[PDB]
Structure 1
């Protein structure tokens, strides 16, 4: 319910290839005014804004993909999975922001179970004591900055403005940290590959702390030019800085340009507000809940909200694979071998084994995986409907105008 402040930090696979000297040591302590501040505050959760560099987001690619799931392992980036402990997520804070954001006409994606690559883990494993677990929980916002067109900077800034008061209206009194990673001036493709611009970096940083809104007119061009093509991903800093106070105070501001990137780092301390907010936090809580208010009075109905998807995820994911003609062939011949290899708990196993249709709907399975499972078992949709209504298929077809069957 309260925002402690947000760190802007480069994410780079070189901070992770090596870490994991005359040239390194000066930036490792341009960093830790905030192993420090992440450890005296010890945030409950960190809203983490980053960019997947075409590892877990490619064939289907989103502009603002909120992470909603329980844990996040290291994405295998082509160099094997980096030995790190799975860091926890925060589904109910994830859910709550999704409700405020959609309510304020931001179109999200939601994702679960996919690796986090160096976009997240490289600066993390240097800001955070990651020896057996990580000191806080994570709400990853994966932005879509690589495949144009992409949201305008003003759209980034505004998302941040909404996100902030989405975190403020959260009913649990915890503290949250923001993190808009990425940047700064660099290009890593084309004949321009090596470009930098430190005359811009310094202006963008001083302006991004004391006057961000003068950055709201910047097109991709102005950005691509003043900082490299890939350096325009600092739209994600205008996101992060959006969710902080109007006025703030930089209690740190390091910067060093070694090999590939301008590696900078801005630490913000959240002041209070510019005034009370226009709409109260309960009236915001009211508005985020309006679309599904009193859905509880509908019976025999199990809304597939984020919380149900997280609870359902392992059995859902498992049953989703029936679309693979090879998975679904073992499912019929050697169901146990499939079970033993799964990561399905034992009631989940029983539910499928028993073909307990109504039980899966209660438990969290979404119908359309059962549609698939029915079809794989050569029993139609109708038998599932019948079994939902505790009726025999003939007693159920009596309730329809005609008796058709289908797969």
Structure 2
């Protein structure tokens, strides 16, 4: 019944592995996990923990192969098992969804002219589970329900920044019209700048990244006009994942308060970003410090 906060976060596999192999506290990973600590401590606080999390991420050729490629999909199943992506199933708890809210949202988006693909059975890869591990740690069960929302950014063309932004506003409407008074979150996961392929792999554009976060907060409507080619050219071929952050942003009102922001280079092949946004109207107090930028180059 209410989208109280928007959170963005990285979901690269290397983070789940640091945890798995118990190296999340070494010289390399330590600064990264430390940067998530404030989010961890914030979300646990009473009234900050969500009932349902609508997790926007892109399937990494896990649940969808080359035979079926949906632009937008929504998981309306009861349970979602962690996918086996080559190393065996990720050793984390099964993701429990919320069929009632999920189906309600799905019906609303179609009536609102978004050509949704409803999924009643699908495995969730690192794109969905790594963010849960980063923010909720290693519980025996996730502390809330999760509605997986896979977006295609693998096979071109992915949806436009303008479409994603609009979809975000549609989700907020469907959530607000849901009878139960749930505390709902929208997480935009992926990014930031990075390139995994070819001679240009290793590309990082901190200028692009920081500017993106900046405009995402104050001028999302203008940011949603940014064409695909600009993401690719500037942030790397895989940096295009950032379009998904616009879905989260669009679910929030015009005025938002950024309670916390973390930016770090490098995290495997990427520049890592994570933040907490809440509508100015009901926002809480920002954290101290409000912004943190780690990495040898920062």
Identify which of structures 1 and 2 has the higher relative contact order when contacts are C-alpha pairs closer than 8 Å and 6+ apart: 2
Partner of 1:326: none
Pairing of 1:79-228 with structure 2 (within 5 A): 79-228=87-236
Q: Larger radius of gyration, structure 1 or 2?
A: 1
Distance 2:138 2:176 in 1: 28
Distance 1:153 1:209, change over 3 A: same
Verify the 8 A CA contact 2:18 2:29 in the aligned structure 1.
no
Distance 1:241 1:252, change over 3 A: same
Verify the 8 A CA contact 1:46 1:138 in the aligned structure 2.
yes
Distance 1:229 1:39 in 2: 36
Instruction: Count residues with an aligned counterpart.
Output: 273
Match of 1:52 among 31, 43, 59: 59
Matched, 1:236 2:231: no
Matched, 1:266 2:272: no
Distance 1:128 1:138 in 2: 12
Distance 1:153 1:79 in 2: 33
Distance 1:149 1:42 in 2: 36
CA deviation digits over 1:338-376, x for unaligned, max 9?
xxxxxxxxxxxxxxxxxxxxxxxxxxxxxxxxxxxxxxx
Distance 1:129 1:123 in 2: 9
Match of 2:41 among 36, 39, 49: 36
Q: Post-superposition, which runs of at least 4 consecutive aligned residues in structure 1 deviate over 3 A? A: none
TM superposition shift of 1:37: 2.5
TM-score (norm 1): 0.65
Verify the 8 A CA contact 1:5 1:244 in the aligned structure 2.
yes
Give the unaligned 5+ runs of structure 2: 21-25, 283-298
What CA RMSD, in Å, does the superposition of the two structures yield over aligned residues? 1.2
TM-score (norm 2): 0.89
Give the unaligned 5+ runs of structure 1: 274-407
Verify the 8 A CA contact 2:12 2:130 in the aligned structure 1.
yes
